[PDB]
Design a protein around this ligand. Structure first.
Ligand SMILES: CCCCCCCCCCCCC/C=C/[C@@H](O)[C@@H](N)COP(=O)(O)O
Ligand SMILES: [Ca+2]
Ligand SMILES: [Ca+2]
Ligand SMILES: [Mg+2]
Ligand SMILES: [Mg+2]
Ligand SMILES: [Mg+2]
Ligand SMILES: [Mg+2]
Lengths: 222, 213
């Protein structure tokens, strides 16, 4: 069936150029138009522009004209979106979606899965992992909390498991925050029986693939 | 461009409830209103296309109405998978323009947070920085006020918060607040307090520690 497949996540510096892509499968490429949508972090959707590969005609939203170029390659059924000079404010998720022409009544019925673009002055950096140790100040009833602070890494993402995936109940891994450095930072916490605490070993397994940083941090009481 | 005004931005409802969301356009767009659902981390999904046409495979609990400038989407008998963000889209004229979205949240009973405070670790202190963390665990509704006090001085602009998505099992939220100071500043003060205000608490809850102890 119809699939639109986008290229992988991108991390860039301001001023750098970038071309991302969307390849169509399962239908005739020249029978439709391909449109590009921006979704800035935590925001809604914006239509950037579109191309008819059949007619080699592009249309742009006035707010994006001169900032980006949309193009297509009929031979590989691929559409492209490109910037010649990225800005930090271009940080967003980018989606391609299928549509029709003047007179068509169905818009964006199939979408790519979409492509994250991060633009920052920051450079790749692995996190430091610090314990958030259980004590009395973190023992509600017969419930204790503990965690790991995964501090000062770039870019996203990091993954965290507990006890190599054996501990899943009561785990909360928070969305990362972007610090004024920034460097991202997140915490992962788990609530456990206070009678734990004690006799059960708690280890957070942290993986930051961009810097190839992998850390197993034992978290002990007091 | 045609401006699209979607309301409400946020709506709580119970599983099984019926809700109606509206979109108003600044120009007459005839029947060219389209509705999308988007879950976190996913592409939007087309539900209904121009002329109130439900897309193949979309449940009939989704219906829409409207012509000209005023439009609605009704979801009947809300299922757990329905609690996502909805966007309207006008496809009358270029540029295509979308409403700002409606996030639907699962309504449940009030639950007060359990609150925990974590002093900075000795390992972190060795590197010249101190992060103090306050955790509010498993609470509802999402609205919560967290105030940091260092020797009774209210900290402002000094902290960052992060909130989880609504839990798929109990429909609660959790929140962390991190207060960041220099090692130097951390060591010149004694009492570190996180004060939490929430509708599930009859009065604010304070968690604190004295540095050293
Ligand atoms: C060959 C050039 C292709 C260029 C790139 C494609 C861009 C698509 C442009 C169409 C955008 C205007 C939106 C109008 C859509 C109408 O077809 C429907 N609302 C039906 O018209 P109604 O029944 O409401 O009058
Ligand atoms: Ca129409
Ligand atoms: Ca129209
Ligand atoms: Mg209601
Ligand atoms: Mg009703
Ligand atoms: Mg449920
Ligand atoms: Mg201070």
């Amino acid at each position: 069936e119809v699939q639109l497949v986008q290229s992988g996540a991108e991390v860039k510096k301001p001023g750098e150029s970038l071309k991302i892509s969307c390849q169509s499968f399962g239908y005739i490429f020249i029978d439709h138009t391909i449109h590009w949508m921006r979704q800035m972090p935590g925001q809604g959707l914006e239509w950037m522009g579109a191309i008819s590969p059949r007619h080699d005609i592009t249309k742009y939203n006035e707010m994006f004209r001169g900032q980006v170029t949309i193009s297509a390659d009929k031979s590989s059924s691929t559409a492209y979106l490109q910037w010649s000079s990225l800005k930090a404010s271009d940080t967003a998720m980018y989606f391609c979606a299928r549509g029709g022409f003047y007179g068509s009544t169905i818009w964006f019925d199939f979408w790519g899965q979409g492509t994250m673009v991060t633009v920052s002055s920051a450079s790749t950096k692995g996190p430091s992992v610090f314990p958030l140790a259980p004590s009395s100040k973190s023992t509600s009833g017969g419930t204790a909390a503990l965690g790991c602070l995964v501090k000062d890494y770039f870019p996203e993402p990091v993954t965290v498991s507990w006890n190599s995936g054996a501990l899943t109940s009561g785990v909360h891994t928070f969305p990362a925050v972007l610090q004024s450095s920034g460097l991202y930072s997140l915490s992962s916490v788990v609530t456990v029986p206070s009678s734990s605490l004690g006799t059960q070993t708690y280890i957070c397994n942290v993986n930051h693939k961009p810097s190839n940083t992998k850390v197993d941090k034992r978290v002990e009481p007091k | 461009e045609t401006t699209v005004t979607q309301s409400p931005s946020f709506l709580s409802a119970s599983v099984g409830d019926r809700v109606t969301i509206t979109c108003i356009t600044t120009t007459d767009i005839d029947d060219d209103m389209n509705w999308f659902q988007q879950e976190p981390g996913k592409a939007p999904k087309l539900l209904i296309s121009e002329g109130n046409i439900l897309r193949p495979g979309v449940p009939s609990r989704f219906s829409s109405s409207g012509y000209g400038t005023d439009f609605t989407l009704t979801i009947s008998k809300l299922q757990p998978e329905d609690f996502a963000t909805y966007y309207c889209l006008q496809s009358d004229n270029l540029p295509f323009t979308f409403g700002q979205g409606t996030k639907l949240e699962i309504k449940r009973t009030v639950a007060a947070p359990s609150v925990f405070i974590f002093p900075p670790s000795d390992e972190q202190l060795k590197s010249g920085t101190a992060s103090v963390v306050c955790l509010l665990n498993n609470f509802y509704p999402r609205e919560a006020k967290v105030q940091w006090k260092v020797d009774n001085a209210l900290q402002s602009g000094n902290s960052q918060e992060s909130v989880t998505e609504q839990d798929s099992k109990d429909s609660t939220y959790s929140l962390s607040s991190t207060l960041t100071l220099s090692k130097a500043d951390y060591e010149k003060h004694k009492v570190y307090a996180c004060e939490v205000t929430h509708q599930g608490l009859s009065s604010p809850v304070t968690k604190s520690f004295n540095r050293g102890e």
